[PDB]
């Protein structure tokens, strides 16, 4: 499957793509404002994620840091990124269908649209100004809006026991972005697409 990753933000981002235990495609690349990078993701990829990283520095060997979304200091991510990270999430060719969503469960850094480029399903979007509006206690000093699990490490926020409800913090994310997951047990906003659809992830779709 192809995923065109498009940076419409006015700032550079370093796109990242992983399934947690391995890179997807090269795993990461710089995207200046306006650039597009198309990756190939193997059919059947389960639990894939794409995210943006901000304010990164890498040396000539690809090692460095980012303030949001850093994946063990690598340009080429093999592992998921450090929160806060808005997440485009997907599982492909699962009993004949693909499943896509956006999640704020690991916080929010950059607004995104995640849409098919092929027929048969709608896209999802979380493009509100979550960083600007972020509750004071969730603001990450390194940049972005942390989720409450990251900040407070409670069973309730982290949904450790599979027992949790919505919270004052989850509700903030849900108010700003109704179509993204705001906590682990949120009413799902996953979209079912035809198996083997192709996609576009757009950072900063609306400004």
From Swiss-Prot:
<keyword id="KW-0776">Taste-modifying protein</keyword>
<feature type="disulfide bond">
    <location>
        <begin position="9"/>
        <end position="204"/>
    </location>
</feature>
<dbReference type="InterPro" id="IPR001938">
    <property type="entry name" value="Thaumatin"/>
</dbReference>
<feature type="disulfide bond">
    <location>
        <begin position="56"/>
        <end position="66"/>
    </location>
</feature>
<keyword id="KW-1015">Disulfide bond</keyword>
<feature type="disulfide bond">
    <location>
        <begin position="71"/>
        <end position="77"/>
    </location>
</feature>
<feature type="disulfide bond">
    <location>
        <begin position="149"/>
        <end position="158"/>
    </location>
</feature>
<dbReference type="GO" id="GO:0031410">
    <property type="term" value="C:cytoplasmic vesicle"/>
</dbReference>
<comment type="function">
    <text>Taste-modifying protein; intensely sweet-tasting. It is 100000 times sweeter than sucrose on a molar basis.</text>
</comment>
<comment type="similarity">
    <text>Belongs to the thaumatin family.</text>
</comment>
<keyword id="KW-0732">Signal</keyword>
<dbReference type="InterPro" id="IPR017949">
    <property type="entry name" value="Thaumatin_CS"/>
</dbReference>
<keyword id="KW-0968">Cytoplasmic vesicle</keyword>
<feature type="disulfide bond">
    <location>
        <begin position="121"/>
        <end position="193"/>
    </location>
</feature>
<feature type="disulfide bond">
    <location>
        <begin position="126"/>
        <end position="177"/>
    </location>
</feature>
<dbReference type="Pfam" id="PF00314">
    <property type="entry name" value="Thaumatin"/>
</dbReference>
<protein>
    <recommendedName>
        <fullName>Thaumatin I</fullName>
    </recommendedName>
</protein>
<dbReference type="InterPro" id="IPR037176">
    <property type="entry name" value="Osmotin/thaumatin-like_sf"/>
</dbReference>
<feature type="disulfide bond">
    <location>
        <begin position="134"/>
        <end position="145"/>
    </location>
</feature>
<feature type="disulfide bond">
    <location>
        <begin position="159"/>
        <end position="164"/>
    </location>
</feature>
